[PDB]
Structures are given as C-alpha cells and as structure tokens.
C-alpha cells in the first residue's frame, strides 16, 4: 500500500499507517494500531509512503473467494498528531491510495463468472 | 453484495424522535457494524452515531451527544437508529452503512444505503 | 503393542531439568516416539519449550477414562498459553509424559492413547465438529469417558480393541509407572490456527480394572505432565492488552 | 505507480534544445519511458525533430480536464505538419513534456496519462470511431473532459482509477513541476497514414483538487510540448501548391 | 549550550527501523549523548528495544510545558511494560526523541531537559518523595508544569536559567525540528526497582514563547518517542495472570 500526499506543501504533521494481521479487532485506538506493523508517516518530508503488507496466514493459499470473516490484514493510517498548516492554506486536502501484488503473488485454479 | 435497506425514516417535528433501522443481507450485521451518516443538502457527509454488534460500545457525534441514541439486534439482523430531540438543522440526508466498527469517520463503512430524508421542522 | 518388560521396580532417578521446569522421572528410558518421527522445525523459544503440569485427575474403581486436547490443554500455560493465542498461526510438537504411581499392592493397566484428529461422538458424519466450541475444549481439566464419548467405542465410533493403532503405551502397575509419548505435529498443513484445531487427543482408559488388597487408598492418582517442542508462530501480530 | 520523490524544490537549470527550439527544463530528471522502448527507427531530420510548444490551458478549481491527440495536436506545427500532410505514410515517436508550475503555497494532482488508440466516448461498441473527423480532431487547442468524454469513465467506459496501468506521471504541486513521457510509436503496423489514424491519446485529468491560499492567481497555467522522435514518411508524394 | 546550526530547514530523510517499529527522522544528525556514555549493559532483546509514542501534546501561546517520567512514561508499552512489571529489578537506557514540527512562519523555542533523579516541588527537603505514588507517576500522558511544579523554579527549588547544567538540546523553530537524547541508566545502584524508583525527568518548558503570523493553526503540536536500550530485568519471576 502506498500512498500519495497531495496536500499543500508548507503543511506538516504525523501520521500512522497501521497493519493487523488475520483475525484481530479492527484496531480503534492509535494505541493499539500502534502495536502491529506500522510506518510513521511524516508528510512535510517524503510526500509519499509505502508499507508492505506481509504474507502472514495459515494455510499455503490464502482463499481469494467470498468467505465469511477471512483473514486478512488491515491497514489504516491514523492522525499520529494533528495537520499543522501554514498561513492560510485551504486546510483540507487528500491523499491518494495505490494497491499493487508483488513477484510472490500467484493465483490458481482458473474460476470465473459474466452476465 | 449486502444491500441494507434504511427503514424508520419520515418527517416528523422539532423537539421530537425517530427510529430508524437497517436489516441485514449478504453476512449478518453481527460482524460488521452499523452506524448513520446525515448529509445535509449541499454539505458533506456528517456522523451522527456508531455502534460495534459483538462488543457493544456506542460512539457519538458532540452535535447530537446526550439526546441521540444508537442500538443493535444482532439476532433481528437490523440496527436500531433512536434520534432524540429533533431540531430544524437536524433534517439531512440520513443514511446507514456498515464498517469497521463503529467509527464515524466520513467512511471506514462499506456497502450504504438509499437514503432517507428526516425533515424535522415540517411544520413552520 | 508395547510389549517391554524394562526391569520392573525403580532403578536410577533421572531428573528432566528444562529451563524453570523440572521433573524427576521414573527412570527416564522406555519413550515411545510417534511413526518414528521427532518433532522439528518447518519468540520465547527455550524459555518457552518447558513441560508444564496438568491438573490431576483421580483414577477410582469406577473411572470410566479421561481426555485432552491438544494444543487445547496447555491454552492456560505462560509462554505457551500467549505465544498461541498472539498468533494467527502456529505448529508444535509435544512430550507427553503421564505418571502413574502405586505399590506393589495395587493392580490394573491404563491405556494412553495418543490419537491425531481425535474427534469425539457425534455420529453425524454427516457433520463433525457438533459440540460447542467450549465443550470440545475443556483446556486443562480435560474431559471423562463414559460407559459424550463412549468408552469401548473410544468415544468416536471404533472399536476400543483396535485403538493400539495410534501410538500408545501402556501403564501396567506391576511394570512401569510412566508412559513417554513424543509426538510431532500432525495435520493437513505446514502450519495452521492453533485455536480453531486440535492437532492430537490425549486418551487414558481404564484397559484392566483398578484392584487394591484389603484396603489400603480407595484410589489412586495419575498426572499428565505435556512440553511443548518446536513451536513456531507467525506472525508477530497484535499485543492486545 | 509513479511514486517518486526527486528533491522537491528547484535544484539546476537544464535546457534541452534541439535545433532552432530551446526549452529550460525545470531540471531534466524523472523521465518515464512507455513500456521501456524508446523511439526508433523502422526528409528534414533534425530540422524536424525538434519540439514545438502547443497552446497554454488555464487550469482551475472546475476544470474537468483535457485531451490531445498524436500525431493531430503538431499538425500545423512547420516541418512536422507538412512532411506529415505530403506522405501517404507516416510513423514517429514523442517526447511529450508537461509543465505545471505554481508555488509552496498551491495545492493538488494532475495526472498525465498517455493511452495508445485512445478512442473516446461513443459506447458504441457496435461502432467505434463515431464523431466526425472534425470533432474527433481538435488538433492544437485540444479537447476537455466533462462531470463527450466522461472524466472517471476517462471517456472511453473504464473506471479512471485504473488509468495508471497506461503509462503516465502524476505532476504533484509539492513535489514536480514536470511530467515527461518518451512514448514511441504504437501502432497494428508497421508504418500507417498520419492524417486518418491516431497513435496516442495525452490526458490530463484534476487527480486532486487544485487550492490556493487566501488570496493570490485564481487559476494557474499548464504548458504541454511535444517533440516528434525518429520520425520517417513515405513516399516523396505530390508537392501540390 | 547547544549553540549548533545544521542546516536550517530539510536536506535528506533517513528512517529509523527498530523492529516493528518505524520513525522518519528529519535528517538524523544533531544527537547529544548524556555526559559522553552510551548505554551500555551491567528477555525480549530486540522486539523490547524499540521506540514506542506516546501521546501527542498541545503547544500553545499559554502553554506552561510538560514534563515525564521514565522508566514510568514507558509503563503500558507492550513487551517493555511487562518485562518491567513482571521482575524485581530492571535498568535500562533511552533514546529519547522529541519532534516539533512548524513552517518558516512560526517562531519560538522548546528547552527539552533530561533530568536524573528529578524529584519534583515539595520544598520539604526533611522528606522529598511527597505525593502519592499515583501523581507522581502520571504515565503516558504526563504531567505539565505551572507558572505542583513551578516552571522557572524548574518545579525543585532551582532557577530555570541554571537547568543547562543537565544535559538537554533546544528545539528552535527556526533550526531544528527535533532533539535526540541517548540517556544512560543513571541510579546510586547497579541494578533497582523500576516500579518505585524513576531515574530519569524529560522536561519540555517554553524558552521562548510561540508566535504565529496572522491567522494559521492556533496551535502547534510536539511528539516523544522514547527507546528503551540495553534493557535487564532480574529475575524471571512470576507470570501471574
């Protein structure tokens, strides 16, 4: 997961993009997200970030079907401070979300469905 | 894939309620949650309240703390929507939507809804 | 199957001292490795691979047996009890000790059966699994056969009688009063949810019945000591707390 | 795709000039290459290959986006347009460069998307091509995107987010001022008329919103420069006057 | 004292990875060792050592300052909390590193101050110690200073003026955006009770006051990130729960 800062240059402040591997409560509190697998993204240095999502589970192929409760990460960024903005700047800015597999991804008996 | 449909929504009075409730399909409500977002006309999406079903712990906006109220019945499938003391700004554009939990935060929902308009101060 | 006849009385007293841990066996020798295979590898490790003691269980005239599941038993025990519980995954062998202690005046065999996939009475092929999450795992007080798994159908739909197909050994009052059992890990996958699945099943039966001259104790105990060998988790998940 | 991070203000000044044209790169470095293929061989040559600047768009917090088409856009421009005009045939690469400069005080994304057969808006699959030569045809003052190409379909019936699997670069106001696309000629054959088939398709699309502080210029200008690459036309036809 | 001037504003970002953990220095440079000696030893090793946040506090106009505690800030972080509940003893050193983040528009100074033994107001020198156990050891959220320590008396009797006697660095909105303390265990003993005695005082109090220009955030926020360094604790004692 990586993503893109778009927000006005002269702003800074702290953030958190967490992970949580298969089966835990979606963390709630920084606190806890702090716990798992997490980077500290800081927006005034590097406007982008990227956190592997590690292949932790159970068995050698993860189900890519409709299960009930799969496991199953869970990144999330959090307000590790709060925006600190620059004279007058529009305050509310985004930031953009880039999802990608990696050279050990595969996938296996060929399924499929159109309509 | 779940489609909920928001139910309990009409135009009602100031000072007064209204329940509103959702009901389940594609999983049971029990493991996502459920809460409700009032976009009023012309404004972005607003939390109002939020509620985990398999560890029940409510979570409020401060501009409905105190008189809203939020319930869930995990075994009725449906999410219960108790808006107390209704006033004139608190007709919106309601809607529920399920997440992760019980966080009102402009998303960290999933599948919405239709959308069901609460106008409060019907009568001038 | 087990047909030993060691020396009979007590020989050597030989101390198994690991890490905080320590027990002194009977003796030592007379262990039963499972298919012939040792546990092994695919973090407390030496801190965390220490036998911990069960709950004793009193063996009576009329007992009908007693069950445990593993890892389930040990889900309680420190290192062991977090380490499984903090992880998504998890694999591991185990030394199954269980002591049996008498006199020269007491009389009978226990049974202890090790058997992979133990699944307990419920007929319903057509759906395993059945009872409850909470009593299929009874964790360290374990659970009692009765004459609900049923004794000489080893509580699953087979013949007692045929039960010394898995490894087991046999505590027979007159010869030993010990039975080793080092068991590897034994499922379907390189490593999988240790809270959702029991690797093996602990079985103790009464196979001869419990006699004692005149009178003496009405009864007798038995204690099952189990360490944990080669058990790796993945992956370093959350701390809840 | 493209997440870089090259210094973030202005370091050194390079100027490209190739022939009579000169432009003054706001450095030169973070280029990107269309499936790592640079422009090749299979007549004014330098003369030709040099790059000539399009018109300047205003880009403000409505704007919906923009489109241009290769070779269409440079078909006025001198050398180009006419060895273009005056050849049954026609095959050339582009370095296509986007400026877009502004302050440490504005804010947003564009992306520049470089699609080969970027055919646009007529769901008609039954029949692409559709909108007259003319339409279909802007040449140098391009065409916009609208809330007819639909700005999240791309218009072309395809989720924008998914636009990044073309090759493109996304001019981020705290980092770049510069996008620049080497694309190479992409084409069924070998060497096609210039006049009637389009090899490329430049969007660029509002990825962020563009803000600026208080008060200070109520829009901002983007700047887009073309320059053909190995660019060869047959044959020798009609010189008509 | 720390009259430094590296750079100014930004030059490169080197991250600091220790374990699960994962800060994005400023830069990296600009680190005071306490009196010249890194931690150093008389178990979770590495996944113990390694920095954990506390909570973020408010810098304001009227802000007083704050202050901590340590090892107490660190009381309810993971495996550090425990392994220090769960023994008798434990020493253990800190990279303490406080980050304050602004523009080229604000302006001000933050005095971080590491002070060992830092027993806090309560002028009765015939019995320092004082407030009870709980309001003296406030945890993560720490404890603020008041114009019940009084900021130019350092909260112990000593003039503000003086506290560069203790080792520290001055985070100047115009300089630097962070200060980086290595402290060493310092105690009259080898080893000690972490639970009743605190051996280091990170102070944090407003050198100058903070000023922003016309109207931007009305206020500014400061972060500490604490690592605990060559950590043992004595010994394994028990594992209640």
């Known amino acids: 997961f990586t993503f893109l800062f778009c927000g006005s240059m002269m702003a800074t402040g702290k953030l958190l993009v967490s992970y949580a591997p298969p089966g835990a409560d979606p963390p709630k509190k920084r606190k806890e997200a702090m716990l798992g697998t997490h980077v500290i993204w800081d927006i005034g240095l590097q406007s982008s970030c990227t956190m592997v999502v590690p292949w932790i589970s159970n068995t050698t192929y993860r189900q890519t079907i409709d299960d009930s409760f799969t496991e199953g990460g869970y990144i999330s960024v959090f307000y590790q401070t709060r925006i600190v903005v620059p004279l007058s700047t529009?305050?509310?800015?985004?930031?953009?979300?880039?999802?990608?597999?990696?050279?050990?991804?595969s996938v296996r008996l060929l399924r499929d469905t159109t309509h | 894939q779940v489609q909920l449909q928001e139910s309990g929504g009409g135009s009602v009075q100031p000072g007064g309620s209204l329940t509103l409730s959702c009901a389940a399909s594609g999983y049971a409500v029990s493991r996502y949650s459920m809460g409700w977002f009032r976009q009023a006309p012309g404004k972005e999406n607003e939390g109002v309240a939020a509620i985990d079903s398999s560890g029940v712990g409510t979570?409020?906006?401060?501009?409905?703390?105190?008189?809203?109220?939020?319930?869930?019945?995990?075994?009725?499938?449906?999410?219960?929507?108790?808006?107390?003391?209704?006033?004139?700004?608190?007709?919106?554009?309601?809607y529920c939507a399920s997440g992760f939990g019980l966080s009102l935060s402009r998303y960290t929902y999933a599948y919405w809804g239709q959308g069901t308009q609460v106008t409060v101060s019907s009568h001038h | 199957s087990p047909n030993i006849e060691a020396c009979g009385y007590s020989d050597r007293v030989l101390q198994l001292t690991l890490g905080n841990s320590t027990i002194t066996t009977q003796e030592a020798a007379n262990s039963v490795v499972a298919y012939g295979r040792w546990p092994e590898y695919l973090e407390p490790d030496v801190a965390a691979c220490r036998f911990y003691t069960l709950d004793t269980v009193s063996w009576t005239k009329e007992s009908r047996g007693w069950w445990w599941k593993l890892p389930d038993a040990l889900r309680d025990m420190g290192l062991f009890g977090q380490n499984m519980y903090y992880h998504y995954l998890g694999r591991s062998g185990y030394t199954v000790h269980v002591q049996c202690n008498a006199s020269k005046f007491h009389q009978g065999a226990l049974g202890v059966f090790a058997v992979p996939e133990m699944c307990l009475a419920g007929d319903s092929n057509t759906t395993t699994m059945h009872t409850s999450y909470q009593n299929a795992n009874p964790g360290?007080?374990?659970?009692?056969?009765?004459?609900c798994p049923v004794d000489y159908l080893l509580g699953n739909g087979t013949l007692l009688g045929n039960a010394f197909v898995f490894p087991h050994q046999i505590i027979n009052l007159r010869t030993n009063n010990c039975?080793?059992?080092?068991?590897?890990?034994?499922?379907?996958?390189?490593?999988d949810s240790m809270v959702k699945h029991n690797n093996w099943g602990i079985a103790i039966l009464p196979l001869a019945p419990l006699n004692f001259?005149?009178?003496?104790?009405?009864?007798?105990?038995?204690?099952?000591?189990?360490?944990?060998?080669?058990?790796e988790f993945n992956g370093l998940?959350?701390?809840?707390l």
């Open chain 3, 140 to 147: 360290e007080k374990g659970g009692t056969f009765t004459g």
């Open chain 3, 213 to 231: 001259a005149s009178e003496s104790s009405p009864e007798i105990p038995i204690t099952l000591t189990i360490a944990p060998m080669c058990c």
């Open chain 3, 237 to 240: 998940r959350n701390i809840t």
């Open chain 2, 59 to 94: 979570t409020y906006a401060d501009s409905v703390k105190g008189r809203f109220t939020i319930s869930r019945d995990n075994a009725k499938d449906t999410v219960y929507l108790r808006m107390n003391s209704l006033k004139p700004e608190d007709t919106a554009i309601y």
């Open chain 3, 179 to 191: 039975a080793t059992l080092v068991l590897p890990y034994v499922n379907s996958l390189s490593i």
């Open chain 1, 90 to 105: 529009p305050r509310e800015m985004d930031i953009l979300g880039f999802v990608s597999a990696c050279n050990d991804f």
